[PDB]
Write an enzyme that holds these catalytic residues in place. Sequence first.
Site, PDB file in Angstrom:
ATOM      1  N   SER A 131      47.650  48.038  36.584  1.00  0.00           N
ATOM      2  CA  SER A 131      46.752  47.861  37.437  1.00  0.00           C
ATOM      3  C   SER A 131      47.074  47.302  38.780  1.00  0.00           C
ATOM      4  CB  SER A 131      45.819  46.570  36.682  1.00  0.00           C
ATOM      5  OG  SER A 131      44.918  46.027  37.668  1.00  0.00           O
ATOM      6  N   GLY A 132      46.341  48.211  39.743  1.00  0.00           N
ATOM      7  CA  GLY A 132      46.758  47.505  40.945  1.00  0.00           C
ATOM      8  C   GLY A 132      46.057  46.283  41.512  1.00  0.00           C
ATOM      9  N   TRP A 133      44.960  45.876  40.645  1.00  0.00           N
ATOM     10  CA  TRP A 133      44.260  44.597  41.107  1.00  0.00           C
ATOM     11  C   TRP A 133      45.352  43.486  40.516  1.00  0.00           C
ATOM     12  CZ3 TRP A 133      43.208  39.972  38.860  1.00  0.00           C
ATOM     13  CH2 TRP A 133      42.341  39.217  39.444  1.00  0.00           C
ATOM     14  N   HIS A 147      46.363  57.338  38.706  1.00  0.00           N
ATOM     15  CA  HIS A 147      44.871  57.438  39.237  1.00  0.00           C
ATOM     16  C   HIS A 147      44.555  57.058  40.481  1.00  0.00           C
ATOM     17  CE1 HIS A 147      43.604  53.063  38.959  1.00  0.00           C
ATOM     18  NE2 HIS A 147      44.222  52.888  38.044  1.00  0.00           N
ATOM     19  N   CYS A 156      38.344  46.923  44.835  1.00  0.00           N
ATOM     20  CA  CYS A 156      37.917  47.012  43.080  1.00  0.00           C
ATOM     21  C   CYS A 156      36.719  47.718  42.902  1.00  0.00           C
ATOM     22  CB  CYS A 156      37.829  45.534  42.662  1.00  0.00           C
ATOM     23  SG  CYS A 156      37.355  45.221  40.898  1.00  0.00           S
ATOM     24  N   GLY A 157      36.601  48.460  41.815  1.00  0.00           N
ATOM     25  CA  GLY A 157      35.276  49.068  41.051  1.00  0.00           C
ATOM     26  C   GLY A 157      34.243  48.188  41.365  1.00  0.00           C
ATOM     27  N   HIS A 158      34.375  46.857  40.906  1.00  0.00           N
ATOM     28  CA  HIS A 158      33.345  45.890  40.635  1.00  0.00           C
ATOM     29  C   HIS A 158      33.094  44.754  41.860  1.00  0.00           C
ATOM     30  CE1 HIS A 158      32.680  48.127  37.019  1.00  0.00           C
ATOM     31  NE2 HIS A 158      34.259  47.702  36.616  1.00  0.00           N
ATOM     32  N   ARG A 164      39.255  59.371  39.902  1.00  0.00           N
ATOM     33  CA  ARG A 164      38.227  58.281  39.933  1.00  0.00           C
ATOM     34  C   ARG A 164      37.176  58.460  41.002  1.00  0.00           C
ATOM     35  NH1 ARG A 164      39.281  51.575  40.332  1.00  0.00           N
ATOM     36  NH2 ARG A 164      37.511  51.451  42.008  1.00  0.00           N
ATOM     37  N   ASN A 208      37.046  52.478  32.006  1.00  0.00           N
ATOM     38  CA  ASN A 208      37.626  51.291  32.289  1.00  0.00           C
ATOM     39  C   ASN A 208      36.726  50.222  31.472  1.00  0.00           C
ATOM     40  OD1 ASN A 208      38.329  48.583  33.410  1.00  0.00           O
ATOM     41  ND2 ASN A 208      37.390  48.956  35.385  1.00  0.00           N
ATOM     42  N   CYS A 209      37.223  49.699  30.548  1.00  0.00           N
ATOM     43  CA  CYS A 209      36.509  48.517  29.548  1.00  0.00           C
ATOM     44  C   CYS A 209      36.887  47.022  30.398  1.00  0.00           C
ATOM     45  CB  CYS A 209      37.228  48.442  28.333  1.00  0.00           C
ATOM     46  SG  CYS A 209      36.698  49.874  27.236  1.00  0.00           S
ATOM     47  N   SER A 210      36.105  46.786  31.654  1.00  0.00           N
ATOM     48  CA  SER A 210      36.664  45.944  32.413  1.00  0.00           C
ATOM     49  C   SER A 210      36.378  44.458  31.910  1.00  0.00           C
ATOM     50  CB  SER A 210      35.705  46.288  33.804  1.00  0.00           C
ATOM     51  OG  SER A 210      36.282  45.050  34.759  1.00  0.00           O
ATOM     52  N   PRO A 211      37.124  43.659  32.311  1.00  0.00           N
ATOM     53  CA  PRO A 211      36.919  42.077  32.174  1.00  0.00           C
ATOM     54  C   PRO A 211      35.832  41.601  33.425  1.00  0.00           C
ATOM     55  CG  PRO A 211      39.296  42.507  31.962  1.00  0.00           C
ATOM     56  CD  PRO A 211      38.477  43.744  32.624  1.00  0.00           C
ATOM     57  N   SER A 212      35.588  42.520  34.397  1.00  0.00           N
ATOM     58  CA  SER A 212      34.526  42.366  35.317  1.00  0.00           C
ATOM     59  C   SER A 212      33.048  42.188  34.583  1.00  0.00           C
ATOM     60  CB  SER A 212      34.587  43.166  36.571  1.00  0.00           C
ATOM     61  OG  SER A 212      35.782  42.880  37.233  1.00  0.00           O
ATOM     62  N   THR A 232      41.526  46.816  32.397  1.00  0.00           N
ATOM     63  CA  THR A 232      42.144  46.641  33.632  1.00  0.00           C
ATOM     64  C   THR A 232      42.754  45.426  33.770  1.00  0.00           C
ATOM     65  OG1 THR A 232      40.227  46.205  34.625  1.00  0.00           O
ATOM     66  CG2 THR A 232      41.011  48.555  34.980  1.00  0.00           C
TER      67      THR A 232
HETATM   68  C1  LIG Z   1      39.250  46.073  39.555  1.00  0.00           C
HETATM   69  C2  LIG Z   1      38.455  46.854  38.574  1.00  0.00           C
HETATM   70  C3  LIG Z   1      39.233  47.911  38.036  1.00  0.00           C
HETATM   71  C4  LIG Z   1      39.799  48.621  39.331  1.00  0.00           C
HETATM   72  O1  LIG Z   1      38.996  49.021  40.331  1.00  0.00           O
HETATM   73  O2  LIG Z   1      40.942  49.210  39.158  1.00  0.00           O
HETATM   74  C5  LIG Z   1      37.778  45.892  37.646  1.00  0.00           C
HETATM   75  O3  LIG Z   1      37.061  45.105  37.819  1.00  0.00           O
HETATM   76  O4  LIG Z   1      38.155  46.299  36.387  1.00  0.00           O
HETATM   77 MG   LIG Z   2      42.675  49.396  41.212  1.00  0.00          MG
END
Ligand SMILES: C=C(CC(=O)O)C(=O)O
Ligand SMILES: [Mg+2]
Lengths: 426, 424, 427, 425
Positions: free
Chosen positions: A90-92, A179, A190-192, A227, A312-316, A346
């Site tokens: 994860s880049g996050w 990705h 972040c996607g979220h 993505r 992405n099964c996100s913890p967000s 992630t």
């Molecule tokens: C940070 C995102 C994942 C992403 O964008 O790599 C999340 O909240 O899962």
């Molecule tokens: Mg990322």
Amino acid sequence: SVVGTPKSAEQIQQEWDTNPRWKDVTRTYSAEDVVALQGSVVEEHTLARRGAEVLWEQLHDLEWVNALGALTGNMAVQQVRAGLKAIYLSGWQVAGDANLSGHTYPDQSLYPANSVPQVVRRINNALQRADQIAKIEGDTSVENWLAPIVADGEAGFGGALNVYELQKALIAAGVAGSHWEDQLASEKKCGHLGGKVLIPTQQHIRTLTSARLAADVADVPTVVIARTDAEAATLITSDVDERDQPFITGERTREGFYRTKNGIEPCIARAKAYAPFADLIWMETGTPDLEAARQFSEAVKAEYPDQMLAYNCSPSFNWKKHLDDATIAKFQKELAAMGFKFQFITLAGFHALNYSMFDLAYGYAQNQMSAYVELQEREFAAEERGYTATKHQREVGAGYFDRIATTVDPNSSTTALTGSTEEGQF
Amino acid sequence: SVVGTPKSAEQIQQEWDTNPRWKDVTRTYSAEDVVALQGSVVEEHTLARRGAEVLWEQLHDLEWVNALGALTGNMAVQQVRAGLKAIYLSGWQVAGDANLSGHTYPDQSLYPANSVPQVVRRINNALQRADQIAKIEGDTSVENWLAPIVADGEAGFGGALNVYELQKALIAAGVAGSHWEDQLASEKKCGHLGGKVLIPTQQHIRTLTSARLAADVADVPTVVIARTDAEAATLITSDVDERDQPFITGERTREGFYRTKNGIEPCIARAKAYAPFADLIWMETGTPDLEAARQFSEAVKAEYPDQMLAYNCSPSFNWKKHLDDATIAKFQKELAAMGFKFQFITLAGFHALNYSMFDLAYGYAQNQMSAYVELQEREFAAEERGYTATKHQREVGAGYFDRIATTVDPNSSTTALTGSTEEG
Amino acid sequence: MSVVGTPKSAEQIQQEWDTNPRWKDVTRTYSAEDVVALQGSVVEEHTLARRGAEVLWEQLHDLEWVNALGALTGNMAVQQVRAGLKAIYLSGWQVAGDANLSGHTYPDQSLYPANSVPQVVRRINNALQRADQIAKIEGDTSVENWLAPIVADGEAGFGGALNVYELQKALIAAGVAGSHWEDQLASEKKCGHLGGKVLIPTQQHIRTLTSARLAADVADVPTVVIARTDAEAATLITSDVDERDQPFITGERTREGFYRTKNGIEPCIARAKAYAPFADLIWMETGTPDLEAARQFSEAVKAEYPDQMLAYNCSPSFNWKKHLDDATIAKFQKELAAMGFKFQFITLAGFHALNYSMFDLAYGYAQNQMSAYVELQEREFAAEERGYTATKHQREVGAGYFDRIATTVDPNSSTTALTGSTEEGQF
Amino acid sequence: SVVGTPKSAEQIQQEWDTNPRWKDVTRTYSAEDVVALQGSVVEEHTLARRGAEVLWEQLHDLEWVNALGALTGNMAVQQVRAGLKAIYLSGWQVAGDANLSGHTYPDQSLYPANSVPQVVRRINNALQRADQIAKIEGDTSVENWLAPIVADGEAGFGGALNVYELQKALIAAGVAGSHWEDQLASEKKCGHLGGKVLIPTQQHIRTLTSARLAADVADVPTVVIARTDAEAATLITSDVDERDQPFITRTREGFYRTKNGIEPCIARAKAYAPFADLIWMETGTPDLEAARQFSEAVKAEYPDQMLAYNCSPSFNWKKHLDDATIAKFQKELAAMGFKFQFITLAGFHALNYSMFDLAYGYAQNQMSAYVELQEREFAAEERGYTATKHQREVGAGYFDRIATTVDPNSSTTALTGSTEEGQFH
Ligand SMILES: C=C(CC(=O)O)C(=O)O
Ligand SMILES: [Mg+2]
Ligand SMILES: C=C(CC(=O)O)C(=O)O
Ligand SMILES: C=C(CC(=O)O)C(=O)O
Ligand SMILES: C=C(CC(=O)O)C(=O)O
Ligand SMILES: [Mg+2]
Ligand SMILES: [Mg+2]
Ligand SMILES: [Mg+2]
Ligand SMILES: [Mg+2]
Ligand SMILES: [Mg+2]
Ligand SMILES: [Mg+2]
Ligand SMILES: [Mg+2]
């Protein structure tokens, strides 16, 4: 010397024409273009080649490939010890706790662009040590210690050449897959997170083309994942691409960005545009919703029946706020049946690391050694499930380095495990 | 410019003569010697100065200072969030999972010598971010985010000059205290590994002198901790030091090392020799034993009544194999009464990280999202105890960077938390 | 599963050791089975380490001699190869002084982090790879081999046998061709031409050379292993335990517990003979550039080991014209080559070239501003006659190469670099 | 502990209101905004503070400040030994030969964003060692070893937050000044490469605001330099800014074509002036008349505005100018208010030429070629060159003094019995 002599354009073209790996893969450049960039010597990238080959086979052989975000080498070792067949990088998590600035960052492409490659190399080094230890211990309980690593290329930290150099560095470090998202690197999120700015469809095809070109020049079959962030993004840098114009409102911000209508429609459109350039496609989404996942999967597979997807099964997401225990239990199995063949949490490593240290430190603050002994006793209990790290000296290679020392000098007086408290008490 | 002008030798000497910080401290070099090494400009080391001052005050004010080994910035943040007042930075954990080679190593001084300084700087950066976030959130639940860091100097990665450079780099990174052991750097071991080789008593006094000199040249009152490995070590490089000769058997190995009689006796002797050069003294020991700790403490304090001690509550011990639950519960409190004022679990972070990921990954391999939701629900439940990392975007500074963005451009269209799933 | 990087069998390794003439004069005190036991399930290929080591070994047997200059930056190595040199020397002294991962300037006492020389090996390989890539797109065939073999400094291994092992492994990962290892105590390590040197016992250095070979064997590359002795000037040794060292021990000890030892060519010859079965090349540090002393060393070693190749440090730590006339200086390397000194190198060439050239330019600039810079630019234009290319600095660092990547990705790109450049317009 | 306690907003505001350092400086954010970002402790940045203070004093006291690009610590040491009063740290040179990827790159923002900060820290460390050695040697021939460093911020490696973090890292490393250009980071170029894309005027003001905010939060008076690439750039990302619309005249990528030259440079310089301690326009040729036109236009509106000039090796100097014009060039620029003048790629050319020249000679004539260099070094000692004695130059005497401070009777000190002691004194 003939070591690392490049292949001919004819040999590369023959592989592109006949290897089923490349069945659904468009390259807008030529085999001659690849050879022109390779100089006189091509370095072999053993772990990148093996990882990419294993990942591609796993994605076709297993019901699905699942992974957890790892931000340290030891995290990846425990994921493989516990039975997982792939590592997610994860880049996050790199922004938050493992990047070359030494700073804690939110997920906005703030860290130095060689940070994820360094963690890829670290994870491979850690898995290699576990593999080396397993061999001298005669431990055959793990079939493949060198689990393929899927790493985060973010938005490539700039233009097509920044993408190229990040892919090249990920390959040098031994990545299996990477990705790449259709966000403006200077405003990456972040996607979220909010405040996302898309780039034009053609610009992301340029990114995916650059990522494939770097893999071709490095002569490894890296898994390339596209993505899209179009589900939530309400901004785009330009209306120049006719594929993006249906979603453009005509309104511009003071920064010169165009407002765009977000949701599943532009995600499906972008996924179809990216499909010829993507081994897997991933759309970020606002909620964990099997019906929304089905709508996306069916729409893409209507045009590209064999196109594999990633989820992405996100913890967000607040999981039990949205879903009942039955839906949570079947979630990944149901996604797998829709063609989501790579599924990953992630931020799993961030949550495991932060919670476990908070829990231990809080107990230690109150009750000192009683709190630590509770953890040590849980570790002893986990040995039944295959946990080995209670014996921390052998876990980090004390036995392996003892074997090097006795190979160099069988009569060495200064080996580590003999007379250790680990030998005496564990 | 007068920025960073060095002090005179007279000002340094006056501070050594009058500051109670230096009450029990021998320096075999002069104030003039320190100024001679400082060039024209002395860089201020704010976090090293603040950390060293806070640690020294805590060691005298608190019943004892306790810490857990941290190998990432986020680990240190959770230790402080949970109420701990100091961070321990283990060289063992750096060898295993956080060193600049990128390799996993056993604890034998194999990693590059700037690895622990980089982790000191990382921990300080992480605590600074938590401090910045707390300020914009109006969170006053933690009094001091910048907890002092005590870091591992191992055997100094060579000679007195390697010691000097490691201490200087730890200070540049913002360390509060550093520990230094009387092992041969080329054969360095974890205190609880075999195959340890001691160096002569005078050579370790040179190490402690070098560590103090680097702190004096950097103009910060770094806490200097002397560690002895003489309880288990059965080898020494040389019989040259008359203080070591009582333990020498006369036998030499093929490597040229001298066999020496190990145990508490040479530890007490070395502790007394090191005391004038050590703010704290630490002896590695084979078992967690309050009576053995008392014997060491009483013997040192008989000669040096005010000498503070440090104790490794090692995960290398099998705790419930040696002790009952009652003894485990009182262990640190009893040590504190004997003068063990710094107590630390060296490998706490390794065990927390490795166990928590094994536990989650095993569950995930079997039951996928059900295993992750068990963890997320434990995180929600911990919010009552002050856990904040469930909200991961604010935890890593999304709100702080939003505040920078709106300071630069109040009308920015691209801030992060507004429209986030965390907000919604 | 994938067969990529499958290890060789002990039988295949043993067959190579038994039959490959590369290993004709090489003693290994460990077994083929011991090597396989350390390799895990996958052996990473080290392309540049393999190619470099193979090219270096061939060059040492084919050329009258191999000569090199110390390089501390990638661009330095590129200019050495552009100028016609066939090997790169990577000095630990220069890394201490101006290219180590601490960011500090150090004297040559093993003060810098142990991964510093590996990072510079990787940097030099990257720089030579870029020159190779540029040459290919430019159709420049004037340099036969851009990937010149790198001989790098392992110092005293930064500790014990395991520190040696890890440094050799990291040098190989970075693409080293050869590495040198000296019989000094790592904690008291010195430049060969500094005082205060402390030797370790003969057997301890054989352990170092054994560890360096073992790391190369586990990495499956035929790295050139160079043994260096510091016994010509060193008057201290850690121990009198080794019977081979006892003839030179005076019996007196320092307060540190070091033994005084009688220095000179005699203990160097003795150590060279002990190291020969474990060394592809042998190097003795010496106090003066002296052809007769070099001959005495060469003849004494070759009396026991006729085919043993030697290495010679043409040190900037010598005041050359204080010791030698111009005629002797002119023939110096040719005469050494005839004695079997097949690798010859100026350790600190890069330090002196960099420091002198910037002092000279900056002094002129302080006095006369742009006139001083134009003098240099005009010398660069004049050097194009000798094959110098760096006057055109944009193509030199790969602007043309990255333009080719950009147009491969997007032929119609509006944002390529060399079109409209002042380099295109004015050079 | 009160160590590193932040100042109040009132103390910061009083400094902004009264310190002549800030006389011509617009801040669109408040003193309260700065304090809000500082947490509980402000780290002192001694070398960033001292360097910025010395640079600002030098720019007002000297006829002009000139510098050469340095890409190694030893390069900077020789620049100061030779009498220069500032160091220039080129991003181009970092791309080519000193960046954290280990790769050779053209000047397109390809290297990791912490690369220039690492070289700032390295140069400061090298100057500190020269300062330490000078003290133990009683060498007072150099007044200030800690010459101010002016470093390259390029286009900030992304958005306003990437700018912020780069400025903060440059300050942590001890930078005195930093420059920031109005190019799109994803398409960033050397001033003298083609394919340049401008960003809107307001976007560059955001960059300069972010660079000042990072310096304010770090509590150091960093010199902020604004660079415009509008002389040659024929592309801009957007026509949104009314100040840019007069030059707008689209590509497949969605870039707008724009009319390049001195006119948009003057316009941008005037827009940037309230946010810039120095202004720099990249230009196509070394031309005193074009420099005069730019200087007079900016100083007509901002009389005290100082300017910076790139004396670029990307120019073929004797193709454009005669020896008389070359000799007076910097002196004439200084009279127009170009108070910081620098040769960006001096270090690249000195390093590459000197090693080519030595290696070519060595390939032909072996030790004769090296002895020619050693003899030039001995000859330069008359001009103040010290590096012939390489052991003392890198601190062998300094570390001997540490060793004898720890143990006066040490048997393992370095300079006693050295060939340097034996053959060079
Ligand atoms: C940070 C995102 C994942 C992403 O964008 O790599 C999340 O909240 O899962
Ligand atoms: Mg990322
Ligand atoms: C490794 C030791 C700690 C140390 O020596 O730093 C242990 O087992 O606790
Ligand atoms: C410093 C030595 C070289 C070395 O010991 O690597 C010299 O003076 O040439
Ligand atoms: C590369 C430019 C300098 C720059 O843009 O930093 C030049 O040619 O001088
Ligand atoms: Mg596809
Ligand atoms: Mg330790
Ligand atoms: Mg004391
Ligand atoms: Mg050396
Ligand atoms: Mg031999
Ligand atoms: Mg630049
Ligand atoms: Mg102004």
